[PDB]
Amino acid sequence: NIDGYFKIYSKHTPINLVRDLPQGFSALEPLVDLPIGINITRFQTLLAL
Amino acid sequence: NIIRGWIFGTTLDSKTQSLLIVNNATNVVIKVCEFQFCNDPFLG
Amino acid sequence: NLDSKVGGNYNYLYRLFRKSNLKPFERDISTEIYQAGSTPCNGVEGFN
Ligand SMILES: *[C@@H]1O[C@H](CO)[C@@H](O)[C@H](O)[C@H]1NC(C)=O
Numbered sequence: 001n002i003d004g005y006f007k008i009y010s011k012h013t014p015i016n017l018v019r020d021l022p023q024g025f026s027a028l029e030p031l032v033d034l035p036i037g038i039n040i041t042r043f044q045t046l047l048a049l
Numbered sequence: 050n051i052i053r054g055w056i057f058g059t060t061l062d063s064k065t066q067s068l069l070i071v072n073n074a075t076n077v078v079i080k081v082c083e084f085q086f087c088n089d090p091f092l093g
Numbered sequence: 094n095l096d097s098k099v100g101g102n103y104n105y106l107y108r109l110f111r112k113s114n115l116k117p118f119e120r121d122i123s124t125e126i127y128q129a130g131s132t133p134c135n136g137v138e139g140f141n
Pocket of ligand 1: 073076
């Protein structure tokens with residue numbers, strides 16, 4: 001969230017491991033960018049339990 | 050597909066501007082407004 | 094004459110001072126006032 005914008009990058013990959021993040025390389029292509037001008041100090045994930 | 054949704058703001062209520070990013074598995078939904086919501090979305 | 098009236102329009106307000114300088118293109122809608130003194134400020138005719 002910089003210069004009055006908010007950029008999103010995403011990358012999906014399936015794994016067969018349950019231990020930790022994999023020892024691989026992957027770039028993250030841009031997904032979207034919207035102009036929003038509010039400062040952010042905190043954030044929290046949302047779960048549909 | 051369990052984890053869906055994000056919130057951002059200073060105090061995260063209706064007194065300050067906040068922007069919300071969510072998903073309900075039919076599309077992508079983003080909201081930016083003075084939204085106050087519970088700490089946990091309860092469905093089902 | 095477009096935005097001028099004999100009575101006047103008092104809706105236009107400006108912030109004399111705040112806790113810290115507002116960042117460029119950052120909008121703050123809360124009515125918080127700078128805590129200059131140890132006592133709460135609250136914008137009252139108390140301790141400055
Ligand atoms: C998912 O979000 C879209 C956009 O708000 C809405 O049209 C759709 O009905 C939602 N799906 C639900 C509520 O099941």
